[PDB]
Amino acid sequence: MKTQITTRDLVLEFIHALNTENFPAAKKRLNENFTFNGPMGHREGSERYMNDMEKMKFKYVVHKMFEEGNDVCLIYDINMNGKTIAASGLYHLEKGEITSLHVYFDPRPLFE
């Protein structure tokens, strides 16, 4: 109640938490029933997605940020196990939490 954290701050804090391998901080920004959708599948729940994140240790460089209504879209490079992939990430927020992420990119370089 004493802070001023906006929906844009939440998303950037989530990305900062992942970048600094602060996985408990990152999970705090997600709704319990958060969903993930990406080229390589779907995850149900913050628990499952954060368990994956802790193993994959992806890093993000944010180039552009957009906000409209209850959505934030990031244009970012994601370092996925040494491969750098240009992506767009669409985050939906409700009730002070991130409720979903849909990430867009061509995953073919990841398969060799």
Add this chain to the structure above:
Amino acid sequence: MKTQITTRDLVLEFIHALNTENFPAAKKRLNENFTFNGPMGHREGSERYMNDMEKMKFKYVVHKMFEEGNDVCLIYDINMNGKTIAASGLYHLEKGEITSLHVYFDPRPLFE
């Protein structure tokens, strides 16, 4: 000088032109030296990209639109030869024209 067409109007007009297979109208919204980047390659110049568009006849359903500074990002479904692909399209505008498009999606379904 008599109209009120904003950068958001330009992008939506471009998408409307493509959807209505009005390829000369669509080209008008692009800078001569427009670039395209997508999962399946790069094109140099409005001429080359519009020649491709006239053959591919892609259709777009826009779900979300964002604007920040000289960039517009669309979240849209693209019907590419009968396959519907969820994508994010990042349009850059300068001097009243679209100067680039970077589109993000997983193209694997297009290969079978």
